Amino acid sequence: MDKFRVQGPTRLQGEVTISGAKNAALPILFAALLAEEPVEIQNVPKLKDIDTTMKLLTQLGTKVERXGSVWIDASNVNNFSAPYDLVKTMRASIWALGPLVARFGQGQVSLPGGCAIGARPVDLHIFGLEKLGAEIKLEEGYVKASVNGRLKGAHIVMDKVSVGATVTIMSAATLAEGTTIIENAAREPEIVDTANFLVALGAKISGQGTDRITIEGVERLGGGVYRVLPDRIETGTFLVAAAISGGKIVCRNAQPDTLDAVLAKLREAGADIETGEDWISLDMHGKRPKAVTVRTAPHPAFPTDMQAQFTLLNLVAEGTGVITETIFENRFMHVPELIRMGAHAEIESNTVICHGVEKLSGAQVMATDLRASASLVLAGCIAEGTTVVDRIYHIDRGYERIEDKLRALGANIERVKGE
Ligand SMILES: C=C(O[C@H]1[C@@H](O)[C@@H](CO)O[C@H](OP(=O)(O)OP(=O)(O)OC[C@H]2O[C@@H](n3ccc(=O)[nH]c3=O)[C@H](O)[C@@H]2O)[C@@H]1NC(C)=O)C(=O)O
Ligand SMILES: CC(=O)N[C@H]1[C@@H](OP(=O)(O)OP(=O)(O)OC[C@H]2O[C@@H](n3ccc(=O)[nH]c3=O)[C@H](O)[C@@H]2O)O[C@H](CO)[C@H](O)[C@@H]1O
Ligand SMILES: [Mg+2]
Numbered sequence: 001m002d003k004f005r006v007q008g009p010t011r012l013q014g015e016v017t018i019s020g021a022k023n024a025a026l027p028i029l030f031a032a033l034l035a036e037e038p039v040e041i042q043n044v045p046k047l048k049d050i051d052t053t054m055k056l057l058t059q060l061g062t063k064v065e066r067x068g069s070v071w072i073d074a075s076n077v078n079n080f081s082a083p084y085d086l087v088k089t090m091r092a093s094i095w096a097l098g099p100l101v102a103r104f105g106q107g108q109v110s111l112p113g114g115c116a117i118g119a120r121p122v123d124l125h126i127f128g129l130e131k132l133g134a135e136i137k138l139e140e141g142y143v144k145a146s147v148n149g150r151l152k153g154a155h156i157v158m159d160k161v162s163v164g165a166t167v168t169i170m171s172a173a174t175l176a177e178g179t180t181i182i183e184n185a186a187r188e189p190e191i192v193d194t195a196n197f198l199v200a201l202g203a204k205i206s207g208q209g210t211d212r213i214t215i216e217g218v219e220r221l222g223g224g225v226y227r228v229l230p231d232r233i234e235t236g237t238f239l240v241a242a243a244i245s246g247g248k249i250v251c252r253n254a255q256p257d258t259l260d261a262v263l264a265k266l267r268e269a270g271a272d273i274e275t276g277e278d279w280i281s282l283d284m285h286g287k288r289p290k291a292v293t294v295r296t297a298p299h300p301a302f303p304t305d306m307q308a309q310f311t312l313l314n315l316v317a318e319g320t321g322v323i324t325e326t327i328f329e330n331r332f333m334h335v336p337e338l339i340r341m342g343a344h345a346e347i348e349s350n351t352v353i354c355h356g357v358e359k360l361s362g363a364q365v366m367a368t369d370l371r372a373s374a375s376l377v378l379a380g381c382i383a384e385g386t387t388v389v390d391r392i393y394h395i396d397r398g399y400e401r402i403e404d405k406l407r408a409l410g411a412n413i414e415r416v417k418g419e
Contacts, residue, residue: 001419002396004389004403006380007362007412012247014409018235018254019045019400020228024190025070027167028197028228029053030095032072033060034103034174035201037223042069043253044228048397049370052090056082060096081108084141091115094122094143094164098172101134101145108142116368118330124158124165131156132169132176153178153217161298163188166213170195173215174203180215187211188299189229189258197226232258233305234399235280237374239263240309241409242282243271243289244316245382249409251280261302268292269313291319291356296327308334308372312379314354315343321354334372337365341383362386370397377402381411388416 020043030053032039044050044066054064060080063073080100087093087110100107112122126136126143132151137144153176156169166186171194173180185191187209195208201224204216230253239259242249243266256263256275263280267273270290272283291314296304304327314321315338325331329350339345340363344355362385367373373394380387389395392415395402403413 002392003416003419004377004380004387004392005414005416006377006387006389007385008381008383008387010245010381010410010412012242012245012249012381012409012411015250015252016238016405016408017252018230018238019043021045021190021193021231022047022049022233022398024193024228025050026053026092027095027171027190027194028226029057029070029072030099031171031194031198033057033062033074033077033096033099034171034221035072035074035223036220037075039072039201039223040069040225041072042225042227044068044070045231045400047400048393049090049092052086053092056086056093056096059083059086060100077104080104080106081142082110084110087112091120094125095167097125097143097145098129098168101129101147102151102172102175105149106146108144110141111138111143116333117328122164124160124162125168128156128165128169129172132172132180150217151176153180153215155181156183158182158184161186163191166191167194170205170213170215171198174198174205174218174221176215176217178217180217182213182215184211185213186298189232189255193229200224200226229258230255233303233371235259236262236303236306237309237378238405239266239280239282240306240313241378241381241406243269243284244313244378246284246286246288247409248283249281252278254278254280256280260300262306265292265294265302265310269317289313289317291317291321291354293322295324298327304328304331305371307331308369308375309378311335311345311352311354312338312375314356315345316360316382317354317356319356321356322351323354324351326350331369331372333368334375337376338379340365341379341387359384364388365390367391367394370394374399374402377406377413381406381413
């Protein structure tokens, strides 16, 4: 079982090329199920989640190929069920439900059980589909959606702001009969890209990025070539990494207007931030970060995907910092791990109180979150001594060659094959 052997402290410095967003390519790939023609998706990150989604697509009859881009061919989808064995490793699998029923009149997807980050029902998805005409049922764990002919456009208002359910409703609405309006929709950059992608295929969508997305059903979807946006999370992760190490870094292949909250939080912390059309520079000028307060929430607010990272930041910052989760009240696994490393923190419900310390100690930790767990690696880079990160399989899910990227920064990280 893979593991990380990290040794610090280390002052991160240098250059890094941000990969395509993981959370953009996922819904985009699932969206390709609709495409009736070959599709070329560019800038796809090399990561576990992508492997999983590619494999899933294959199970449906989709022709798949890959390098920097992914070659998708759905012309011959012959299967409509996403197997329990696969969904149980990636809840995102549910993304195949809407496209499948929207285009085929049918589709089945193992109903996702629990997740370590906490409660994550998919109620909004089904609900969203029913409103479109989908006749949905639950057989032996499988979500069975079925529609007689095309789906009908409807006026849907969302109980919660949900990236997942917005993509489900949006995507399926492209092939529906009539007009669909998603009120109280997610405004995540990844939603905008999934829509842009869809539009490129010949779909009719407006309002992407706003709280009101409008979809105009069409006959069918062609093929084409789309370019996935840069991963905002990766970037924020790299930025934080430099910011907690007194680093001086540059971000290539970026999109600054997706980090406003992170960017501002960083400046607040005390870093020197400059940005360009597709780049972002950060220089700590040899300074220890200043504690900051964070409140996760739907974009464009602070993203929970950066939450753990910022928690780390506060752990070694001067002052009392506060992190409050409003998206995943249980996304704290990292804390007890970082505390093993000499960190001081208190947990009160969805909030963690931070007490910065002068140093961190190398020790044995355990990853458990495909994104929060990165904080663990970041921790080992600035901590004193050797940190062994267990279960890095998590990180390989949301990070393309993370050790390589870190290494190009001066990090003393090594991958270990034998448990
Ligand atoms: C971890 C990762 O990233 C996830 C987080 O970044 C999250 C940010 O919210 O959004 C997406 O998951 P999500 O599941 O789609 O995100 P919500 O629907 O927005 O969930 C936000 C809140 O909404 C509740 N909710 C959601 C749907 C529903 O039907 N019912 C319902 O109650 C939910 O349980 C939360 O309490 C991301 N995953 C992907 C694959 O894109 C990762 O990289 O894998
Ligand atoms: C061998 C090992 O040590 N870990 C494996 C396990 O990682 P993990 O053990 O990290 O977990 P997982 O993703 O299977 O489960 C994460 C958490 O969710 C819970 N959960 C998960 C799925 C579900 O349908 N219901 C549910 O309740 C589970 O009890 C655990 O607390 O699985 C992965 C695929 O998923 C890989 O095979 C990992 O190598
Ligand atoms: Mg899991």
